[PDB]
């Protein structure tokens, strides 16, 4: 059975804080078949390499994808000093990972564009003393604690959101704000890959 990467090629890719995660097990994969369809602008890895990630056997392969403007490549480089790693998307510290930035060629019209790019620029708890804010950051490999209060696309740059927390939850509020970047002529995306060499047999292998 060949791992089927077709879902990336169909529909509107979510924004970075709503990244779509696909988990592959017990299948053979052809990574170059996927990547050859895109114009790859950046391809960086941690604890693995582009050559190795395409050629090893894993207990599982996890593929994340989202809309992401190439002009925010540096917002990735700043890592937890900037809003993407703080509030939107932060890959595993525990397993090898890669992060790919790619442009959608004009031929792939089945990938439809969102109205704009959006990301979360603030996620904080406003405490019951109605005074101090405590930032609530994303944990590696997880979704933002503010995904439930930010819309799938931010309507206007700087829009602000809040949700009252119950007394049992400690009171106060969960608060967030969104930023936007204008859509590009061709859609630009990020692909995140995490692999696991697990107890479970390494039955995610390259197609030969």
């Amino acid at each position, epitope marked *: 059975v060949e791992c089927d990467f077709s879902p990336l090629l169909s529909g509107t890719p979510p924004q970075v804080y709503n990244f779509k995660r696909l988990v592959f097990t017990n299948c053979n994969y052809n990574l170059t078949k996927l990547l*050859s369809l895109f114009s790859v602008n950046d391809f960086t890895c941690s604890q693995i390499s582009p050559a190795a990630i395409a050629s090893n056997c894993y207990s599982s392969l996890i593929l994340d994808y989202f809309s992401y403007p190439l002009s925010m490549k540096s917002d990735l480089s700043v890592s937890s000093a900037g809003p993407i790693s703080q509030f939107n998307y932060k890959q595993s510290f525990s397993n090898p990972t890669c992060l790919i930035l790619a442009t959608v060629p004009h031929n*792939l019209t*089945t990938i439809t564009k969102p109205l704009k790019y959006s990301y979360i620029n603030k996620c904080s708890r406003l405490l019951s003393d109605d005074r101090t804010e405590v930032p609530q950051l994303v944990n590696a490999n997880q979704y933002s604690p503010c995904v439930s209060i930010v819309p799938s696309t931010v309507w206007e740059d700087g829009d602000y959101y809040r949700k009252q927390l119950s007394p049992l939850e400690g009171g106060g509020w969960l608060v967030a704000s969104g930023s936007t970047v204008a859509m590009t002529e061709q859609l630009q995306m990020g692909f995140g890959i995490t692999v696991q060499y697990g107890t479970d047999t390494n039955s995610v292998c390259p197609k030969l």
Partner: nanobody, 129 residues
Framework: VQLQESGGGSVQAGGSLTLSCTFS?????????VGWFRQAPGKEREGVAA????????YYADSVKDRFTISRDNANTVASLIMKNLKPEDSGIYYC??????????????????????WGQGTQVTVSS
């Protein structure tokens, strides 16, 4: 059903026909693709043309290039096949198909019938010398 071919008929060699693949009112191929195939007695089913939602990618069999044209409406609910300069060996039952495995479709396998999960009932094309 879901896929319906129309527009087939009988025609003299050198004539033309336009086939239509109409999706049920609730369905679209906006995020997928449509292939046109044909079946002749004693031959395997043959892909002749295909197009994706949005029309960014179009493919043609060598046997029909420069004679056939595949197109879509803006809404990706009708895929049309304009066939010109028809030959007797173009006679067949013509099928449209959708719900394709997209990655393989984009990667050179557009004409592989097994990749398509949803098939119309077909329309008759009869070309007479």
């Amino acid at each position: 059903v879901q896929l319906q071919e129309s527009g087939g008929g009988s025609v003299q060699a050198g004539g033309s026909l336009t086939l239509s693949c109409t999706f049920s009112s609730e369905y679209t191929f906006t995020h997928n693709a449509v292939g046109w195939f044909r079946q002749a007695p004693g031959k395997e089913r043959e892909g002749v043309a295909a197009i994706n939602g949005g029309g960014g990618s179009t493919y043609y069999a060598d046997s029909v290039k420069d004679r056939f044209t595949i197109s879509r409406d803006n809404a990706n609910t009708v895929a049309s096949l304009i066939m010109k300069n028809l030959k007797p060996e173009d006679s067949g039952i013509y099928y449209c198909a959708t719900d394709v495995r997209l990655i393989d479709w984009y990667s050179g396998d557009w004409s592989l019938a097994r990749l398509y999960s949803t098939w119309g009932q077909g329309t008759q094309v009869t070309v007479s010398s």
